[PDB]
Amino acid sequence: AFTVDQMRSLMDKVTNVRNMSVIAHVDHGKSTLTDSLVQRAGIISAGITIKSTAISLYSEMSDEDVKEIKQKTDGNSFLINLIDSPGHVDFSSEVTAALRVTDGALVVVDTIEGVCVQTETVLRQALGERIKPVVVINKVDRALLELQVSKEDLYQTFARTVESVNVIVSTYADEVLGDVQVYPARGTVAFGSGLHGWAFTIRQFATRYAKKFGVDKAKMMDRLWGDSFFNPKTKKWTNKDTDAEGKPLERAFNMFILDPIFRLFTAIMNFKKDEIPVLLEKLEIVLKGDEKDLEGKALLKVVMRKFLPAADALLEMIVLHLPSPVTAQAYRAEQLYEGPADDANCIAIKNCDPKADLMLYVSKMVPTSDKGRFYAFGRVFAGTVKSGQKVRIQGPNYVPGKKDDLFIKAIQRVVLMMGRFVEPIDDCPAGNIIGLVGIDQFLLKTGTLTTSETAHNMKVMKFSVSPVVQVAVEVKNANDLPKLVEGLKRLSKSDPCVLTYMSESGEHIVAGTGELHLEICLQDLEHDHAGVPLKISPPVVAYRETVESESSQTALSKSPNKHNRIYLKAEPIDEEVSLAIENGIINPRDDFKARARIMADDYGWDVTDARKIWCFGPDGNGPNLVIDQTKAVQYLHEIKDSVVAAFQWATKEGPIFGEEMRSVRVNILDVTLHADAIHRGGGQIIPTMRRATYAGFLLADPKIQEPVFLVEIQCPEQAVGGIYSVLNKKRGQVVSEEQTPLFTVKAYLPVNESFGFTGELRQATGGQAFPQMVFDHWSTLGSDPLDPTSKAGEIVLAARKRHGMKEEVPGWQEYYDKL
Ligand SMILES: CO[C@H]1[C@@H](O)[C@H](O)[C@H](OC[C@@]23C[C@@H]4[C@H](C)CC[C@H]4[C@@]4(C=O)C[C@@H]2CC(C(C)C)[C@@]34C(=O)O)O[C@@H]1C
Numbered sequence: 001a002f003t004v005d006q007m008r009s010l011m012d013k014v015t016n017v018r019n020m021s022v023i024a025h026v027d028h029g030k031s032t033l034t035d036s037l038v039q040r041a042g043i044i045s046a047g048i049t050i051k052s053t054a055i056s057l058y059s060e061m062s063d064e065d066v067k068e069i070k071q072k073t074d075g076n077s078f079l080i081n082l083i084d085s086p087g088h089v090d091f092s093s094e095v096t097a098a099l100r101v102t103d104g105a106l107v108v109v110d111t112i113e114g115v116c117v118q119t120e121t122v123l124r125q126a127l128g129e130r131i132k133p134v135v136v137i138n139k140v141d142r143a144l145l146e147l148q149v150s151k152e153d154l155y156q157t158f159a160r161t162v163e164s165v166n167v168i169v170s171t172y173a174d175e176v177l178g179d180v181q182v183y184p185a186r187g188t189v190a191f192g193s194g195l196h197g198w199a200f201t202i203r204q205f206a207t208r209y210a211k212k213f214g215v216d217k218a219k220m221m222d223r224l225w226g227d228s229f230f231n232p233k234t235k236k237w238t239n240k241d242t243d244a245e246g247k248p249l250e251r252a253f254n255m256f257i258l259d260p261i262f263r264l265f266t267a268i269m270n271f272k273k274d275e276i277p278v279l280l281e282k283l284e285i286v287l288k289g290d291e292k293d294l295e296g297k298a299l300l301k302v303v304m305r306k307f308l309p310a311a312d313a314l315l316e317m318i319v320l321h322l323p324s325p326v327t328a329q330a331y332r333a334e335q336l337y338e339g340p341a342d343d344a345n346c347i348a349i350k351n352c353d354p355k356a357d358l359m360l361y362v363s364k365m366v367p368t369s370d371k372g373r374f375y376a377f378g379r380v381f382a383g384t385v386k387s388g389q390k391v392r393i394q395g396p397n398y399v400p401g402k403k404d405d406l407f408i409k410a411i412q413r414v415v416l417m418m419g420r421f422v423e424p425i426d427d428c429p430a431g432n433i434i435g436l437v438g439i440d441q442f443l444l445k446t447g448t449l450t451t452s453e454t455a456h457n458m459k460v461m462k463f464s465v466s467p468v469v470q471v472a473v474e475v476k477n478a479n480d481l482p483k484l485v486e487g488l489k490r491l492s493k494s495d496p497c498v499l500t501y502m503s504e505s506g507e508h509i510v511a512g513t514g515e516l517h518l519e520i521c522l523q524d525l526e527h528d529h530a531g532v533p534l535k536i537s538p539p540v541v542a543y544r545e546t547v548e549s550e551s552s553q554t555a556l557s558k559s560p561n562k563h564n565r566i567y568l569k570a571e572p573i574d575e576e577v578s579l580a581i582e583n584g585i586i587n588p589r590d591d592f593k594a595r596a597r598i599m600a601d602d603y604g605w606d607v608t609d610a611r612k613i614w615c616f617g618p619d620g621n622g623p624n625l626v627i628d629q630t631k632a633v634q635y636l637h638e639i640k641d642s643v644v645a646a647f648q649w650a651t652k653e654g655p656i657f658g659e660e661m662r663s664v665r666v667n668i669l670d671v672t673l674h675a676d677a678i679h680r681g682g683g684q685i686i687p688t689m690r691r692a693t694y695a696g697f698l699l700a701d702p703k704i705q706e707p708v709f710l711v712e713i714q715c716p717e718q719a720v721g722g723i724y725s726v727l728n729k730k731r732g733q734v735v736s737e738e739q740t741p742l743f744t745v746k747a748y749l750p751v752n753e754s755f756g757f758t759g760e761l762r763q764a765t766g767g768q769a770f771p772q773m774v775f776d777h778w779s780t781l782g783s784d785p786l787d788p789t790s791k792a793g794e795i796v797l798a799a800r801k802r803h804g805m806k807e808e809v810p811g812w813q814e815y816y817d818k819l
Pocket of ligand 1: 467499501502504505509543707751
């Protein structure tokens with residue numbers, strides 16, 4: 001219970017402030033531990049409400065304790081800002097926003113489960129912010145009760161957990177910071193049970209036994225952890241787990257810390273009415289009043305709370321080990337400032353200078369009961385913010401010279417953010433956390449308030465600007481198509497970063513900058529833009545049907561009439577020729593003579609074959625060709641249109657699963673026709689050529705080609721490794737690595753391997769990589785398209801079922817008409 005003056009006074013001694021948060025999965029006792037801190041040291045003031053965003057704690061340390069702080073200190077009082085944090089992590093930018101206003105973190109890990117992925121993810125982001133961690137291994141009660149673990153197994157579990165945490169810390173912490181790893185013997189690891197209400201540090205026991213052993217606690221805390229053994233028989237401390245005779249010695253941690261706790265649990269839970277009193281009296285635990293009548297769990301909870309109040313263990317680590325803003329801003333200043341390292345504002349941040357020009361970072365907007373009004377939440381890194389102070393509001397795009405995102409207004413009121421309540425205060429100096437009212441409209445989400453025209457913007461969130469997240473959108477009710485199509489246009493007009501287009505497989509595609517952006521776009525589409533039910537799904541990928549070699553034997557097919565026959569063979573068109581056709585070097589309408597010369601002289605074709613191409617397909621211009629190689633066919637000219645038409649048909653619909661053919665060359669070897677045109681009409685020859693083409697194709701070692709993206713990723717050096725890791729899991733192929741900006745990695749990524757790519761990429765790069773993708777080329781899959789179990793076969797089988805086709809692919813024999 002403090003007055004505003006008392007708060008303001010506490011806020012003046014920034015050396016004695018601790019800005020931090022709790023990094024913990026909700027299921028690991030996050031709430032219970034924070035509640036414990038609040039109940040023990042929460043600060044309350046001596047008709048609006050907001051969403052609780054931060055809580056203020058007050059803690060006092062003894063004169064001797066304060067001397068242990070390896071940091072500038074002034075007095076024995078401390079103000080601790082416990083900043084609320086989401087948790088939902090896969091490396092979200094929101095989390096990074098809350099972390100940004102903190103300098104230290106209390107990391108909660110589970111005794112049994114250890115370090116979960118979420119916690120690892122948030123810790124990594126925290127380390128990326130140069131935040132110093134302190135750890136609490138929670139839920140010890142579970143190991144004692146459920147698993148009935150032994151003292152040594154518990155110790156080993158603790159040791160493994162501490163190691164897992166330090167692996168992460170040693171991997172992501174900046175070298176300039178020195179050793180940021182956590183050490184039980186140094187008092188930076190606590191152990192306890194949030195729900196139960198107890199916890200301890202080695203320092204607390206070292207303090208509790210230093211005088212009893214007649215040694216200074218510095219020596220005691222080193223002896224109460226790790227390989228230190230006190231042999232009662234020799235009265236000596238050693239680092240050997242066996243005595244002279246080779247007999248096993250019990251670890252000091254187990255002997256002096258775990259044993260007392262184990263015996264309390266055992267004695268109390270087993271209702272040992274006579275032992276309990278002795279044990280309590282020996283540990284100087286005094287029960288008062290009705291507590292003396294308690295038994296079992298109820299008694300245990302009461303005994304442990306008096307024995308090792310959890311909050312006390314946590315506050316100790318926060319005060320003695322987490323940095324103050326003064327300490328932290330010295331090495332965080334540069335990261336936080338996008339401007340010159342030797343700039344006046346940067347220097348003011350480095351020195352946490354309250355007299356300098358204002359540098360206040362708005363971390364987020366907090367919802368209030370003030371009719372739709374939100375209060376800005378953030379931290380004063382330099383200067384002092386004041387009520388009715390002219391300030392410069394700079395958005396995520398504001399740049400010194402250009403007036404983009406600039407907003408010069410007078411701060412209506414500065415308020416302390418005490419849980420769900422606010423308390424107006426005249427001003428707030430550098431180093432503190434604070435809330436601002438009246439900043440609503442001028443800013444939304446992150447921002448920066450400065451009182452310097454030269455003031456640059458504090459580190460802004462980098463955001464994707466490419467429509468890399470894409471999905472297929474279809475109406476649930478056919479009749480609504482007109483509304484969807486219209487909606488897409490409306491959506492596009494209202495949003496510059498959204499992309500909509502028709503896919504090669506006839507699907508309406510909606511693409512956004514990121515998952516969240518795409519999600520907003522799809523919601524507004526279904527609800528407003530189109531205002532009709534929609535079905536969202538992973539876009540269907542288009543494939544191409546090709547041949548790996550020449551037909552193993554002449555393909556023969558006859559017309560329904562049975563009077564006409566076509567003999568042909570299919571073979572591959574070289575990639576460079578297909579590309580030449582697709583890109584306009586070799587064209588359907590070019591003079592057949594000049595075109596033949598190019599194909600022969602430049603692409604190695606036989607000039608006669610080239611001069612005799614009957615057509616390109618599909619659509620008369622695709623990268624597939626029919627070459628006449630017949631010799632003495634009397635009515636050849638009369639079946640040409642029919643042969644061409646059939647090819648347009650076959651190349652549009654391949655025999656593997658109906659996809660378009662690509663790079664297929666068909667050579668008409670011979671044709672036998674009935675003398676009378678009456679039996680040689682299109683209705684007879686078209687079916688014949690189509691049937692023979694499919695046969696030739698199937699006989700030519702059929703293959704399917706998949707679409708491949710050219711992916712370009714910008715990112716910091718130490719994150720490049722993530723790119724390669726993900727690419728290797730998705731048949732990616734690095735193309736290049738170029739660069740004093742960032743790194744740009746280019747690679748090939750199969751389109752059917754890109755769904756969700758964006759998500760796994762940020763996961764492997766700690767949300768530091770930005771992907772861009774554009775269709776690049778077709779790639780032939782080597783596996784057998786006709787084998788349902790191969791890679792290509794799996795794709796083919798799935799598409800066939802999706803189209804209601806018979807699962808098995810009709811073989812070449814199905815189209816072959818023996819003589
Ligand atoms: C500028 O934005 C670009 C990029 O996002 C990318 O190049 C994208 O690629 C779309 C596809 C383009 C391919 C060519 C037209 C032929 C094969 C087509 C694809 C089919 O599998 C591969 C990619 C991904 C697609 C399906 C899955 C949608 C394509 C399609 O549009 O169907 O196109 C948009 C317009």
